[PDB]
Amino acid sequence: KLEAFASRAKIVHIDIDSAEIGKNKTPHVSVCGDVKLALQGMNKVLENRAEELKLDFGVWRNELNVQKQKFPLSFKTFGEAIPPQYAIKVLDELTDGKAIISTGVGQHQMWAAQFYNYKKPRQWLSSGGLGAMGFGLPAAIGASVANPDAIVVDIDGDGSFIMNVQELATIRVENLPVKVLLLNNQHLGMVMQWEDRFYKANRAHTFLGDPAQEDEIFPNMLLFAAACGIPAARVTKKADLREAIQTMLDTPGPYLLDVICPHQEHVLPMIPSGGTFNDVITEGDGRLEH
Amino acid sequence: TFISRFAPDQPRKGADILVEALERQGVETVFAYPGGASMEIHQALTRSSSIRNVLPRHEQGGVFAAEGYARSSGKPGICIATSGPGATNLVSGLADALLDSVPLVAITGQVPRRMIGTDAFQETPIVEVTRSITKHNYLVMDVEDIPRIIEEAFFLATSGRPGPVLVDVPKDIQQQLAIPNWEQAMRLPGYMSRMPKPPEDSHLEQIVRLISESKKPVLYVGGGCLNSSDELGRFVELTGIPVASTLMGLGSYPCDDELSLHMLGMHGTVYANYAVEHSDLLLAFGVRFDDRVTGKLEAFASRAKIVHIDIDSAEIGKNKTPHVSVCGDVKLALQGMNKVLENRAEELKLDFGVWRNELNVQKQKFPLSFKTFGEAIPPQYAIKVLDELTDGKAIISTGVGQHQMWAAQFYNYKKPRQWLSSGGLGAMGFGLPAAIGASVANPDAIVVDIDGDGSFIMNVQELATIRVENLPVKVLLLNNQHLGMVMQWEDRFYKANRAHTFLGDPAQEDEIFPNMLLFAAACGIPAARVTKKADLREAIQTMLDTPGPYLLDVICPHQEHVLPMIPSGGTFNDVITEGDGRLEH
Amino acid sequence: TFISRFAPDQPRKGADILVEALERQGVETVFAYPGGASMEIHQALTRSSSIRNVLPRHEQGGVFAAEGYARSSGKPGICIATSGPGATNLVSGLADALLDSVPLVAITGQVPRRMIGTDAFQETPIVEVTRSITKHNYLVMDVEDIPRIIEEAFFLATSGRPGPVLVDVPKDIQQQLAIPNWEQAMRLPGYMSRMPKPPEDSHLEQIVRLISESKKPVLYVGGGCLNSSDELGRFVELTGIPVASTLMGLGSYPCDDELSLHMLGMHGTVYANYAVEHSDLLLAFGVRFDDRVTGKLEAFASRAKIVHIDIDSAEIGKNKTPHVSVCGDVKLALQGMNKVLENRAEELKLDFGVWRNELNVQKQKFPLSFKTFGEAIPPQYAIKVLDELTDGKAIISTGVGQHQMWAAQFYNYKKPRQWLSSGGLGAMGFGLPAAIGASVANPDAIVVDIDGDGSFIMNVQELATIRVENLPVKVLLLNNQHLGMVMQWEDRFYKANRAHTFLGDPAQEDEIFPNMLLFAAACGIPAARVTKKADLREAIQTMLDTPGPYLLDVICPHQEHVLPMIPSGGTFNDVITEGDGRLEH
Ligand SMILES: Cc1cc2nc3c(=O)[nH]c(=O)nc-3n(C[C@H](O)[C@H](O)[C@H](O)COP(=O)(O)OP(=O)(O)OC[C@H]3O[C@@H](n4cnc5c(N)ncnc54)[C@H](O)[C@@H]3O)c2cc1C
Ligand SMILES: Cc1cc2nc3c(=O)[nH]c(=O)nc-3n(C[C@H](O)[C@H](O)[C@H](O)COP(=O)(O)OP(=O)(O)OC[C@H]3O[C@@H](n4cnc5c(N)ncnc54)[C@H](O)[C@@H]3O)c2cc1C
Ligand SMILES: C/C(NCc1cnc(C)nc1N)=C(/S)CCOP(=O)([O-])OP(=O)([O-])O
Ligand SMILES: C/C(NCc1cnc(C)nc1N)=C(/S)CCOP(=O)([O-])OP(=O)([O-])O
Ligand SMILES: C/C(NCc1cnc(C)nc1N)=C(/S)CCOP(=O)([O-])OP(=O)([O-])O
Ligand SMILES: COc1cc(OC)nc(Sc2cccc(Cl)c2C(=O)O)n1
Ligand SMILES: COc1cc(OC)nc(Sc2cccc(Cl)c2C(=O)O)n1
Ligand SMILES: [Mg+2]
Ligand SMILES: [Mg+2]
Ligand SMILES: [Mg+2]
């Protein structure tokens, strides 16, 4: 809700598009230009008048630092099952946060954004405005061609991945070292989450598996990879996860890792559509209590 | 509680529903010219005992009259035309109303729904044609949509940034019997969500702060201030900031007031343009930073902190980037600032005497000036006499050209909506019909059309309208026998090479042509010509004292130039202060 | 070999390139009204020693004059206007030219390229506005494109189905120095591939065959035949098929010829409409099956085999499905058929005497008729006298309304392009400016504007143009003090309830208002009024014999109705043959 967004803040907006300034919210101060140049100019001033300015926001930082310790990002671990959040956190550690990450759209996309520490821009390739599924795998292809010596990982959902699964052929033929970290929850996860929160968990065409063989992972994504001569593996138990991801990384060329996750996971926290900060949801998932 | 001429359960023609929809909007005057595709509407109009139709002699006169009606009252102006040639005759008025932000509702008849797109008799796709020159338009495709659309049309035309809305109505819709529902809710969910909110105290405090820190502030006031006359005056009293006005903003702050810099821009005063040039704080209220005001943008207010308050979010930062911006009604902004300025008055210690004296020096060294040649009439002087004899209380409409600028420069407008002139589009022939609408909207007022001989003749047919409707319209025709402003540019930039700017008869070169008095006589309107400056004062008085319509043909030497002048895309250093179309000895 | 006023290697302004581009198109006359955005163009025009500018007093007059110029000559008409209010003042003319298929090239100045879209001074997106009411339009974005675009504009305007083309030219383009390339090839690969091919012998033989088998054939001739006067006449001689003409097709086959059914349609003759109704073969040449002709389509030529020859593939089968169709120039089709008809003449044995006698009976039982009341002037009779005194050789332009129909009914046009009238759009105020263009295109001809008092006053300002340009334009003003045609519909369908159709002054109700003679006197044009039928013959002769411009105010009783009349969407059985706006005793 715009009226509640930064309701007591003096707003400075620097944008290269004059059409974007004052579009949704009215700024007190505006600069139409390259933010790169604005930063340079301000840095110059900030350094000369440094001792004159006496900048210190320690009190504000401590206030925020309290919130960061009371309400940090969190995920729950259920038995030997793999938390999707944890898998992404392990990829971070084993790639030393230096990997180029492309994603599809959905829960896996948010977790990729939350639990990977990006050290530079253009490490993070994700469809934000349009939010188009099936973006992940082909984007990884382009990223790998533009960065041949880099670690490129497509963190994909099972729905998003299958939409442009045909591009696995492209990857093998072009011999691109594209890694696919497929977080498989057998569902259209994000739509499933909204069903849980706002429609009493009533499933409306969000399950992507085969209802006849309900406990089988469907489709078998490993065989998609095998069809295109791409080495692949599945991991289900959290204990085997660290070695599995390492194998994906250490194996030269393309690789698919089918990471099986419990589907009841929810992306948290969440401010509902058109809501305010007071409306924030901090706990809960798609599981029923005892 | 509104009273209908129909039972609430009684079926009636769509045409009757339409006219009642107008009645429920408080409409009392329309400017409608009949045609086959709108006959039903005109029939319905005669059944109304509350809506008067002023029949023009040309639909362009019809829409320009609606404009004058609107501009002079703050009410929406309503014009109606038939399909095809009727509709296309409205186009200049629509484009004019859009550029000058004039609230206007245009209704056009259309061929039957089934015949649309078949190149039928008198069919133009007017909705397609006018989409880019209206705030919004409609093609009514069902009789049940009429009440809702008319409500939306008037709402859109009068709210936010005012503008023209066109409603196209097929003939079969006008004929169809139906029972109207007046409680229908409008379908403008997008438009209403983006309607500007009342200004936060936060934004207004920041502006007041900037004022206290400035040493050379200037008010830059325009057509967005037409409803903020009292608030602006209160603001000036509190701050003591000098006021520069746009062509569209004249009257918002009284011209003959001590703190008035008069008009800025291309033909703005030297001191007004000087003030903006050397200001360190520019208060842009209800303006749109037009090229005709700014010249070269990079040089316009180059050393000033710019504050821009506009009701259209699209206008902020469009041509120039403001340091501080407020998207909202300038009327409300002024109220909020006035409240703060009065409480913290002794705390603020506002005094810009040094700046005012600096500008006051420019005002005395480079004031507006005109030259008098023998017994010939200076057009500037004629307008100055009209001011004196009307005590600056007259409603002035003009055409476009030199006479328009002189009307803006040498008449002291005490209130907004005294000044009715085409600014953005700058359409000739606007003057006479606008005066008609102004006179209908203000029956007890002095209405004077200050027109040029080129502009006047374009819609000269509306003299018939004036006599028939018995309107006390005064025409002060400044006759230079030329397309004056184009002539001036020829003199300055094309070595005085005449390219079709002379409007007289080359055979009888020293005769005033045409004889405008005979145009007036044709329509039974009393008229006179004055040539010698000595006879001018009595002539204008006679025009004013003679009851009803009157034409005064004022003969002026054509060599006169509008001064001063900043050339196209120029800066303040490029200003032209002397010279005319005469050759030296 | 064309001669330029510039060296082939010498840079020149874009404005000069533009004007030379016109010169190379054989243009000798333009109708240009100056403004700031087109000044460069007007400067360039004065440098031309081959192009004459006729300065109108209104751009609507400018474009209508270009139309008259075009319609009366078969050449393209060229009008020029400035940006904004200049451009928007052309709109009615453009829409008119499109609906009546008139070859016309309109040039408008535009704001500098960089300022387009910024709501600049006198900026309208005229290209956007006029896209749906022009055959094609252009926005010149480079000075190098000027020669090619002008060539394309004239090509598109004059080829295939003729129409209006608008070329928008930014000011900075006009100012830019460049060296033109006149050998540039046009970029219309789509348009030229779909240009109609010459008619195959196959198609023409089929039509000739149908003619030999028909027993009640009727020619249905329209504005597509304006260049096929000789071919059509040769065709009629060979076949002996009676000819019904549209409003737009008048003159193609001479009206006073033995085989002429005169006009068909809403106000067509009883016998012409009868012929189509009972025909078994309809030869639709250069027509577009307008609702004003057909009425209820299902009832139009319900028992006739329909042959349709049109140069626009889009028009074939649009409103009615033809049994046989030919997409091409009707001029070529007629030539091919005439060749066949003459060789196989004795083989074919064509004789439609029985059909002709049947129609000849209708022509004698239900001819065109008017009533004479005392000494009052029948408008029909006045037009009939003009015919006699001009020997049917005059070029006639009209406004729109009753006078327009009477001009069509009671004047015998011997050739096409004698009849200049707005048919599709039906725009009032067309008459006077069209006469201007016609007179410039035909200096040695008798040009008469048969106008109504409503239509005449709309562009009355063009009387100034007529005097200044010294054009021998005759105005036969049929003055009924009303918007006559709307008045007629009020009488027939709204119980004679007047809704703003009276054009006089209600205060002085029995005085002719306005005094049109004084309009003429204002512009130094000799004029007279005639009221009694006895004085009419001498009055019209005086108008004709008096050298130069002349206005004849013909006062007519307003109760006259145009007859016969088939009501909107009606059939032949619905035809109205008697009655007027008078009440019985
Ligand atoms: C021959 C000629 C010469 C000209 N030369 C000059 C000249 O020398 N000087 C000059 O000034 N003009 C001149 N013009 C006129 C010029 O083209 C423009 O019309 C004028 O400069 C612009 O007026 P404006 O800036 O006040 O804004 P406007 O065109 O009047 O528009 C009003 C602005 O205020 C906003 N607004 C409207 N309502 C509100 C509200 N309630 N609250 C807040 N904001 C609101 C609108 O969004 C809009 O941005 C000339 C015109 C002609 C024909
Ligand atoms: C008040 C009023 C009353 C009217 N009442 C009547 C009436 O009673 N009767 C009547 O007829 N009209 C009447 N009209 C006029 C009517 O609206 C149309 O203008 C007219 O009927 C259509 O003309 P048209 O059919 O000949 O085709 P046009 O409009 O003249 O178009 C020409 C057609 O021929 C085609 N064509 C063009 N060139 C060629 C070529 N070289 N070769 C082959 N084909 C070509 C074109 O593609 C087009 O289809 C009236 C108008 C007004 C203002
Ligand atoms: C259907 C949908 N959104 C609608 C949709 C439909 N189609 C496209 C191309 N894009 C989108 N965003 C989503 S986020 C669910 C995607 O599920 P996933 O790809 O398996 O990822 P996850 O399960 O982690 O949410
Ligand atoms: C032709 C022209 N401008 C181009 C033009 C063309 N057509 C229209 C409808 N509007 C405009 N503005 C002007 S300002 C000259 C008008 O002359 P005038 O009406 O006699 O006034 P003045 O002589 O004082 O300049
Ligand atoms: C108002 C009208 N039609 C609507 C109309 C409105 N405006 C335009 C520009 N064109 C048309 N056709 C007509 S035919 C009446 C014209 O009256 P007139 O010019 O005096 O001719 P007449 O009285 O013989 O019918
Ligand atoms: C006022 O005199 C006239 C004449 C006329 O045809 C010549 N039609 C009309 S009305 C009209 C207008 C446009 C389209 C259509 Cl379809 C119509 C119609 O209803 O027929 N009025
Ligand atoms: C003939 O008198 C006038 C006056 C005037 O400004 C008042 N501008 C022009 S020309 C013009 C026209 C439109 C756009 C633009 Cl940008 C211009 C321009 O070149 O400045 N001519
Ligand atoms: Mg999923
Ligand atoms: Mg003038
Ligand atoms: Mg009339």
Side-chain angles (χ1 to χ4, degrees), chain C residues 22-23 25-30 50-53 69 75 78 440:
Chain C
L22 296 182
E23 292 176 345
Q25 289 295 318
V27 179
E28 293 178 287
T29 310
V30 303
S50 64
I51 300 186
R52 166 194 191 181
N53 181 39
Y69 186 98
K75 316 175 64 174
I78 297 93
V440 174

Side-chain angles (χ1 to χ4, degrees), chain C residues 452-454 480 482-484 503:
Chain C
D453 54 317
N480 57 9
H482 284 73
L483 296 173
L503 292 173

Side-chain angles (χ1 to χ4, degrees), chain B residues 175-218:
Chain B
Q175 292 173 348
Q176 190 168 351
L177 290 322
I179 297 172
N181 175 28
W182 306 105
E183 295 302 320
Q184 270 271 9
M186 300 190 277
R187 293 174 194 174
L188 299 161
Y191 182 80
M192 290 184 201
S193 66
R194 288 137 24 205
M195 280 194 303
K197 331 228 167 192
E200 309 180 24
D201 307 326
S202 188
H203 295 75
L204 299 185
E205 292 176 350
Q206 186 184 13
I207 301 182
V208 168
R209 181 192 184 184
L210 283 183
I211 296 183
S212 66
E213 297 174 0
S214 80
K215 276 136 189 59
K216 306 178 171 183
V218 175

